[PDB]
Amino acid sequence: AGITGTWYNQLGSTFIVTAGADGALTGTYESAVGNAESRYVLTGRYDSAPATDGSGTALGWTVAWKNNYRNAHSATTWSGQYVGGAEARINTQWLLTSGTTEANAWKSTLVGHDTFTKVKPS
Amino acid sequence: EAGITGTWYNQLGSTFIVTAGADGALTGTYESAVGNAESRYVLTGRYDSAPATDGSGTALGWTVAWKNNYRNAHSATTWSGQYVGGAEARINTQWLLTSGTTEANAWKSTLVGHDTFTKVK
Amino acid sequence: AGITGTWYNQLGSTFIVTAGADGALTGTYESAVGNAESRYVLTGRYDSAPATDGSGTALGWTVAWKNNYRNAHSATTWSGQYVGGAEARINTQWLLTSGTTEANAWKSTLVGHDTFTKVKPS
Amino acid sequence: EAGITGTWYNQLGSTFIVTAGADGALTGTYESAVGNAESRYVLTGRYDSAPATDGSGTALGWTVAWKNNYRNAHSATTWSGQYVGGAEARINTQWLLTSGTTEANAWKSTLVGHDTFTKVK
Numbered sequence A, C: 001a002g003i004t005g006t007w008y009n010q011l012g013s014t015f016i017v018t019a020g021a022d023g024a025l026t027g028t029y030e031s032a033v034g035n036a037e038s039r040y041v042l043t044g045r046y047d048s049a050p051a052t053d054g055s056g057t058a059l060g061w062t063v064a065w066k067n068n069y070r071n072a073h074s075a076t077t078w079s080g081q082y083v084g085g086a087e088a089r090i091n092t093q094w095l096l097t098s099g100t101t102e103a104n105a106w107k108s109t110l111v112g113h114d115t116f117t118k119v120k121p122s
Numbered sequence B, D: 001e002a003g004i005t006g007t008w009y010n011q012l013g014s015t016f017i018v019t020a021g022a023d024g025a026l027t028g029t030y031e032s033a034v035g036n037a038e039s040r041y042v043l044t045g046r047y048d049s050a051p052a053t054d055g056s057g058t059a060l061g062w063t064v065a066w067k068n069n070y071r072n073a074h075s076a077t078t079w080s081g082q083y084v085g086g087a088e089a090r091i092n093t094q095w096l097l098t099s100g101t102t103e104a105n106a107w108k109s110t111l112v113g114h115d116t117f118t119k120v121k
């Protein structure tokens, strides 16, 4: 139980993370789609003392899409909530910004939504 | 990365102090002028440490969870954007602010907006 | 088969729409949540000649949350795709802007995602 | 609604011509300075026809499907925002641009951004 673990989203991407006691998120991300191969570094933050009223735990993290294999000149941030219990979720919305010229900045940022569970796809 | 590293302010009057590491790390503190926030908060993020040199911006993002040793808003913001270098350096962003909610209220958990940061120099 | 019909999202809201031959969307929306009661007018647009390569049909619509019962001083736009076939979907992301003072404009706009099907909840 | 009704231009140089009806309707045409677009496109939307009078903006939104009698981009944009009246009238928006995609490519279907419109007067 908790944020720390291996998570998978609806695309089949793999999010491996450790939640530090005082709010750090640290791990790796492997995307099933896009200009990406293998694992990328991620860092983020989470609320390390959530409310005690049934609310989720706010969090977010970033991946810059550069590793030893590829550089897509882009970065994604995920913002969302962890929802605990017997079917633990992380429900997110994300912003993927590509480096562009200023004139093309209007088309620099994709938006979407990812839902993560600890269930490995089969 | 001397470009990104420094002190920045946005249109709301918020203060972003950041260091860009050789490995692509962003670390620093954020102080918001608005919202359920006081003092400085930890931020962490990532940037493209080997960006295109064809006139394109440098992609980056960072997160603040709105808990510090004074206050906890039970929320987190992520900024996604690009650094545009030169003498009038800017970081242009869009952001998502998610509050912890009950499941019934999750539909109203996330605000969206845009911040432009100017480097103090 | 088609966009015209009665749709329901994951919240249990009801979206009743007619797709005009040349791109109009016209109908009503009833939200299961929020500062809303009964039906509200909606209008929007869709691509009335979609690609023939398996792509979805782009569309969007707006509701201003004023009717004879309530006025929330807000408006939502949904932007997304219709995906036809034997389990027809409308997959959307939305922006809900409330009227605010300029100083509070930073907190004026909620974002989320709704998926619609023609299956009435039970 | 004389306030909203008129001709507006955004920071890209796009042209928004709109009429606000007594019933809350928005109707008009949009011409984009950028993207897979030429000439005018139909728009339709809605606004709050009885807004607060406490200093708040007037909520509104509209849609353009990027098909006209010259071109079809297989895409649609919605703008969600508020009208701020007075002598320096503005419509401040965020937008979502969804392109039709295959199901496999749906993750990359939607762009987000922000436009500010100034009324020509």
Ligand SMILES: O=C(O)CCCC[C@@H]1SC[C@@H]2NC(=O)N[C@@H]21
Binding pocket: A009, A011, A013, A030, A031, A032, A033, A034, A035, A036, A065, A072, A074, A075, A076, A094, A096, A112, A114, D107
């Ligand atoms: O193509 C790129 O610029 C890099 C890869 C982006 C993959 C995106 S991030 C949001 C979405 N969720 C995923 O797991 N993968 C895609």
Ligand SMILES: O=C(O)CCCC[C@@H]1SC[C@@H]2NC(=O)N[C@@H]21
Binding pocket: B010, B012, B014, B031, B032, B033, B034, B035, B036, B037, B066, B073, B074, B075, B076, B077, B095, B097, B099, B113, B115, C106
């Ligand atoms: O109210 C909260 O939940 C915490 C503070 C949020 C402040 C937001 S983050 C996006 C925007 N940019 C800022 O500098 N401040 C606001």
Ligand SMILES: O=C(O)CCCC[C@@H]1SC[C@@H]2NC(=O)N[C@@H]21
Binding pocket: B107, C009, C011, C013, C030, C031, C032, C033, C034, C035, C036, C065, C072, C074, C075, C076, C094, C096, C112, C114
């Ligand atoms: O509370 C308001 O300001 C008016 C009602 C908003 C309801 C929102 S629109 C997006 C989401 N999808 C729905 O079916 N209902 C909520």
Ligand SMILES: O=C(O)CCCC[C@@H]1SC[C@@H]2NC(=O)N[C@@H]21
Binding pocket: A106, D010, D012, D014, D031, D032, D033, D034, D035, D036, D037, D066, D073, D074, D075, D076, D077, D095, D097, D099, D113, D115
């Ligand atoms: O490229 C397309 O799919 C059609 C044209 C899109 C133009 C976009 S809509 C949001 C932004 N604001 C504008 O005035 N133009 C761009």
